[PDB]
Structure formats: structure tokens, C-alpha cells
Structure 1
Amino acid sequence: MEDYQAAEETAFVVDEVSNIVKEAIESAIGGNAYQHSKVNQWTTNVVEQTLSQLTKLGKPFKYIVTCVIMQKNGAGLHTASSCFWDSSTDGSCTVRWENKTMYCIVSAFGLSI
């Protein structure tokens, strides 16, 4: 019973990071509209809250958190990420998000030591 959650606490559990991403996004942005003066606070707060609760998982990883936040003005949103890791240990989380006024992509990573 103990080694299975020990295997959960050691490998890159991919989308509990996505729970940390949605808690970071729903803490930072909320249901607010696009005003550009708060976008730097929103990107910094999503990235700092995602680096806050990935460090409290206790997992030996190097974490990279990127976040793109986009105004809905008819401009359409494309990102990409291919990387170079060891495939059995590491992985990638990428969550898209939007509302009436804003777009959001947060891509999050974990790289083993």
C-alpha cells in the first residue's frame, strides 16, 4: 500500500499540476475583464502560485512554469512546446483557458534530478 503512493510521490504526476494551475488561475485572474495593467500581476501570480504549490508536493523535480495570457480582440492563439528530457521520468502539463474577454495557456513542466 505504501510503495504505490511512493511511486506517486516520485514520478511526474502530470495533471495534479493541472489542479495547481487551475487553483493559481482561479486565485489570480478570476472572472475579471481585460485591463492590461493587471495582466502582469495575473501572469506573475499564476506563475508564482504554481511554483508555490509544486514546491509543497515534496517531489524531487526541477519545475518550469510558463504562462501566456491573451486579449480577445480577434487575434487567435497558438503556442507550441517540444522538449528534451528523459521520457520515463518527466512529462508536460499544458492547460488552455478562456472567458468572455481573455485567453490563457499555462504550460508546466517537471524535470527530475
Structure 2
Amino acid sequence: MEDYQAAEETAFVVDEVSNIVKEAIESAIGGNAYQHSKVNQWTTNVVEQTLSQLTKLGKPFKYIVTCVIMQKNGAGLHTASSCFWDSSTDGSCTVRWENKTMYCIVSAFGLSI
């Protein structure tokens, strides 16, 4: 029982990362519409909140967070991520959020130290 608890403590749980990413996106973006001059601040705030929460987790992981904001004007969006790590300890979580005007794709990667 103790070993499973320790493994869960040291594991990269995708659900909590996705929750953190959703909370950061909503806090920084929320109901706000797409504005080109403010995409800089929005991406910065989302990534900073996500990395702060991931560090607050206390898990022995190096974290890499990437955020993409795109305007809804008919343009096509495709994000793909293929990597090379140890699948037993490192993880990734891609969260797609969208409102009436804007796509926000945030990919978080946690690699064991």
C-alpha cells in the first residue's frame, strides 16, 4: 500500500496537469476575446501559472510548457508532438481550450530528474 502511494506521489498524473492547465487558461484568458497585442500577455500568464503550479506540486520533474493562441478566422490549426524519453516515468498532457473566437493549445511535459 505504501509503495503504491509513493509511486502515485512520484508519477506524472495527466488529470491534475490538465486541471492545472485549464485553470491557468481560464484565469489568464477566461471570457476575453482574441486581441493580437494581448496574445503576448495571455500566453505569458498561462505558461507562468502552469509552471508555478507544476513546481508547487513538488514532484521531481523538469517541466516544459508550450502555449499556442490562434485566431478563429477559418485558419487550420494542427499541433503534433512526438518525443523520445522513458515512458515509465515521463509524461505529457495536451489541453485544447476554445471560445467563440480563439484556440488555446497548451502542452505540458514532465521529465523525471
Q: Same fold (TM over 0.5)?
A: yes
* Structure 1: unaligned runs, 5 residues or longer: none
CA shift at 1:94, angstroms?
A: 0.3
TM value normalised by structure 2: 0.95
Q: What CA deviation, in whole Å up to 9, does each residue of 1:85-104 have, x standing for no partner?
A: 11111111001111101011
TM value normalised by structure 1: 0.95
Contact 2:51 2:63 survives alignment (8 Å): yes
More helix as a share of residues:
2
RMSD: 1.0
Contact 2:69 2:102 survives alignment (8 Å): yes
Residue 109 (structure 1) aligns with: 109
CA shift at 1:15, angstroms?
A: 2.1
Q: How many residues align?
A: 113
For 2:37, what is the secondary structure of its paired residue? helix
Residue 75 (structure 2) aligns with: 75
CA shift at 1:5, angstroms?
A: 2.7
Equivalents in 2 of 1:9, 1:41: separation in Å?
A: 33
Q: What CA deviation, in whole Å up to 9, does each residue of 1:56-83 have, x standing for no partner?
A: 1110011000011100011011011001
Equivalents in 2 of 1:62, 1:10: separation in Å?
A: 12
Equivalents in 1 of 2:79, 2:3: separation in Å?
A: 37
Equivalents in 2 of 1:12, 1:85: separation in Å?
A: 13
Equivalents in 1 of 2:109, 2:47: separation in Å?
A: 12
Contact 1:69 1:103 survives alignment (8 Å): yes
* Structure 2: unaligned runs, 5 residues or longer: none
